[PDB]
RNA sequence: CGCCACUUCAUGGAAAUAAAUCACUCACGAAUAG
């Protein structure tokens, strides 16, 4: 399902075949090279995210995970992951303020984790903003026209454009949530 | 040298101002499925 319906981005292509619209014009904005893993822990927590293989969005999240993923000395916070799933409406709004998203960005976090044992993971905290900040650009760019025209469409129901129609924001968020808790569960150890 | 007192008895200003407004850790673990 992965591979096929998120990764190769089937869903758009499959819903819209099956009610006969399909036609040139939402073929163009077919989307493919993409990356898709979900992570089912013992309990039954689905991390489930999508991101584009092609630009500087994948290379910055290898990045950040060979950063913090301590092996066998950069630090890790993990209060950080619970901001970014609480504040996701207020990380929304800043990341679609075009004009100043980077400085609003970098004045939330530093707002936020305002305290002394803050200031050692200052790397952390750009490192999570630079990849957000590139995520919503490539988002918006794959993504914006071509939920501009599914919402539009005049014989699509309500649920087929609600799950057809992905946010910009709240997936270059979700996807930020997912790779910190990825790190996070490699790093924990139950000790 | 002798005689002798009456007065006046709080006004004006400052009446709170800044710093920190939660932080870190845990965000499920096992068993039952395969």
Redesign the pocket.
Same mark, same amino acid.
């Given at each position: 399902y992965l591979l096929e319906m998120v990764a190769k981005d089937n869903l758009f292509k499959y819903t819209l075949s099956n009610k006969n619209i399909l036609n040139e014009n939402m073929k163009r904005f077919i989307l493919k090279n993409k990356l898709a893993f979900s992570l089912q822990?013992? &309990?039954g927590?689905i991390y489930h995210t999508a991101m584009s293989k092609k630009g500087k969005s994948y290379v910055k999240f290898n990045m950040l995970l060979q950063k913090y993923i301590l092996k066998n000395s950069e630090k !890790?916070? &993990? &209060?950080?992951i619970?901001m970014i799933r609480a504040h996701a409406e207020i990380l929304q709004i800043i990341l679609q303020n075009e004009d100043k998203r980077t400085e609003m960005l970098k004045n939330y976090f530093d707002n #936020? !984790? #305002?305290?002394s044992?803050?200031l050692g993971y200052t790397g952390l905290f750009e490192d999570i903003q630079t990849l957000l900040c590139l995520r919503y650009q490539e988002n918006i760019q794959d993504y914006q026209n071509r939920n501009e025209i599914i919402q539009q469409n005049t014989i699509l129901t309500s649920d087929e454009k609600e799950i057809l129609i992905v946010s910009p924001a709240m997936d270059a968020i979700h996807t930020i949530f997912t790779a910190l808790q990825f790190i996070?569960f490699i790093n924990?150890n139950?000790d």
């Open positions: 822990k013992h &309990s927590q !890790f916070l &993990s &209060s950080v619970q #936020n !984790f #305002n305290e044992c803050h996070h924990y139950k």
